[PDB]
Structure formats: C-alpha cells, structure tokens
Design a binder for this molecule. Structure first.
Ligand code: NA
Ligand code: NA
Ligand code: NA
Ligand code: NA
Ligand SMILES: [Zn+2]
Ligand SMILES: [Zn+2]
Lengths: 157, 157
C-alpha cells in the first residue's frame, strides 16, 4: 500500500482539505484561474470537455472540492459527484447523437491517472471510434475464485 | 435516439419497475435464484466477482433495484449506487495489493454493454495486465470545441 501520514490525513485515504490543493490544474479551473470548455456547473460539481477529445463530446466531471480519486473518497463525496452524472450523460448523448457511453474513473498511475484531482470521464460512443476498452476474459477456477471473494469480504468487514 | 414509449415509462429513460425485470440474470442474482461470488451486500447494492476476471479481483457492483444503465438513472439511483463504491474499491485494492483501479460503467451495446442491468466494474490494476483502456488523443480546434460545449450546455438547460 501507498504511504500515509500527514497533519491533514483523511480517514478514507489521502488528505482532507485544510481551500484548494496547490499545483492542481483542476483546482485552478474550479477557481476560475484557468479557462475550461464548460458544459455544466453547480455548487458541488464542474463538467467540461476534455481537450484531447478521445471521442466527440468526451467530458470530464469533477468535484469542486479537491479529492485525489475515488479510492480516497468518502461515501458523501462519491454520492455527490455521481448524482449529477446521469443528467450530464443524457445531455451529452442527445447533443452528439451518440449510440452509447462509457463512464470511467481512473485511480493512480497504473490505471492511467495523471492529474490527481478526481475526474469521471463521459466518453460518447458511435457505431467508428478509435477509442476502446480491452476487456480480456479468463475461465475461472471456482475454488480460487471463492477464496478470493472470501479474502475481499474480510477486508470490507 | 432510442425509442421510448411504455405503460411503465420512466421520466429519465427506460422503464420504472412495476418487483424485478424478467429475463434479467442480475435480478435473478439479487433474488438469490442464481449464485454469485459475493464480496459485499447491503439494502441497496450487491457486489460480486466478475467470473471472467478481466484482472485479478475484477468486481461488478450492481443496484438491487433494476435499472438499465446510468443513462437511465435518476440522481437518487446514481447517488445510492456509487456511494458504496469507494469503500468496496479500497477493500479490493487491499485484498489484491493492486497498484491502481479503474471504475467503469458501460451504457448500451456500442459501449460494450451486454447485460441490461446497470453494473459498475471495479478493475484492479497491477504494475502486468492484459487489460487496457485505449485513450486516443487529438488536437482541438478551439472554435469547434467551443461550439460543441455550447450545444451540450443547451441540452442540459
Ligand atoms: Na479521503
Ligand atoms: Na483519468
Ligand atoms: Na429511468
Ligand atoms: Na459492462
Ligand atoms: Zn484539485
Ligand atoms: Zn435486473
């Protein structure tokens, strides 16, 4: 596991905020210091087009309150961030006439995270894209699978 | 857009539930009719290992209440489903000693959806995987990008 230990430690991982994180591009966008291509904003959340446009309409939805990623969120932070996502996604699909949509949150560098303020990608999909998720499949060993589930249950409890 | 029109139509897309959806494998799992490799359960949510194990510990988190996908959810449905996800993800990461994690929801067939009961994938990542997300990048035309954001804003409002 990743090291912990801060005068601002959070119970759920990461740091509590003791106004914004420094050297955080997304905090600077929230503060209005740096411009973004905005599509939605309310008291808790900001959504803007991802400038790299993995597909047409690719959007990031971020909390205004800084948190590193979902691995470090409280249930309240996660509930607040995602409550807005269906409404934004419906609008994105309508505007782009998309056939489908992927919702993606990446946590830490091995999962592709490079900006350390939580962001949820909304990636419209068009029956055409160079965008893709490689979901490989394996045949389960049910005995090992049962033991893995037991191990994970232990950690929740 | 996809056709609408049902005696059980939902305001947010899809159908309201008028006890469970028939011919739904995930509803049958929720009902306890079909077994699953469970890792977490509460009043609103069930999480179990995905039998295909895209990576070690790959888990699906589903609402007990049937809804097709996030495109058709209410804010309450989305808030309830994702509130539990950080806690489950932390446990999964601890149990597997994962270096990162992807959180993914796929909506409709072009985005990879094949089971039509909403499910959020938690995909542990290990610095090793054959699992991958292909996030292609493009250079923006800022004038077109600004018009696209305007169009999307129009649909939210
Ligand atoms: Na935290
Ligand atoms: Na990311
Ligand atoms: Na609905
Ligand atoms: Na899926
Ligand atoms: Zn930030
Ligand atoms: Zn169902």
């Amino acid at each position: 596991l990743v090291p912990r230990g801060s005068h601002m430690a959070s119970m759920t991982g990461g740091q509590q905020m003791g106004g914004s994180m420094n050297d955080c591009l997304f905090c600077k966008i929230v503060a209005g210091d740096i411009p973004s291509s905005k599509v939605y904003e309310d008291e808790d959340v900001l959504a803007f087009l991802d400038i790299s446009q993995a597909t047409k309409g690719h959007t990031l939805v971020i909390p205004k309150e800084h948190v590193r990623n979902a691995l470090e969120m409280t249930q309240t932070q996660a509930a607040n961030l995602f409550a807005r996502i269906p409404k934004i996604a419906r609008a994105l699909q309508k505007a782009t006439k998309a056939d489908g949509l992927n919702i993606i949150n990446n946590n830490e560098e091995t999962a592709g995270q490079t900006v350390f303020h939580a962001h949820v990608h909304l990636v419209p999909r068009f029956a055409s894209d160079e965008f893709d998720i490689r979901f490989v499949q394996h045949e389960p060993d049910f005995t090992r699978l049962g033991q893995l589930a037991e191990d994970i249950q232990k950690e929740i409890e």
